[PDB]
Design a protein around this nucleic acid. Sequence first.
DNA 1: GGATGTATATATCTGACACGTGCCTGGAGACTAGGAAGTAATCCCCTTGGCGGTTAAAACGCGGGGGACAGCGCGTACGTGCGTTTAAGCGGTTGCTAGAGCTGTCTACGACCAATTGAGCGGCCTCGGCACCGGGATTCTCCAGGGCGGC
Length: 50
Amino acid sequence: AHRLKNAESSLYESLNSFKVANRMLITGTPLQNNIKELAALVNFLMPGRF
DNA sequence: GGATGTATATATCTGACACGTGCCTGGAGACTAGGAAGTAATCCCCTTGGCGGTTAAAACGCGGGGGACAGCGCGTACGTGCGTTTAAGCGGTTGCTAGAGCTGTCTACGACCAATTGAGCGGCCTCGGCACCGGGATTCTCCAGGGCGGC
């Protein structure tokens, strides 16, 4: 899921437009450079709560 | 008796219309100065229709041969197709820097104006050089005297 660490990358808008009820991310490094990567991951998971 | 083709209805996507707002740039109104329109005078170039004379260019004719074009052969180099490689295209990382945009301050540099004067334009006088006329030095053609031959 670290490949999904960028919100502006085309994979993010490709996977965020999918009509899926439940999502899950498997990764080894959740944070790599800053808090914004984790913010993008939790926005992909829960869009609005965090 | 079961499932398939087709018609009408409903929810969703998407381009377009109108509403709202800023802002800044164009428009309205007034004033002024100078750019350009108009006028008169002077002088030189251009127009149209002629004439005269020179002469070199243009036109015409003719012969001939050089060159353009057509045909043929040939061989090579480029097109075509297929299998393999490779690198373009896309998506992505990661930081730093260049640059556009905006705001702000200030200072040196260029516009502007008045007085001045010295470099540019025209004519006049003089010199350098080329040319016209007079005088001296040098060389070429010619007329006459002396000697020899013939009746």
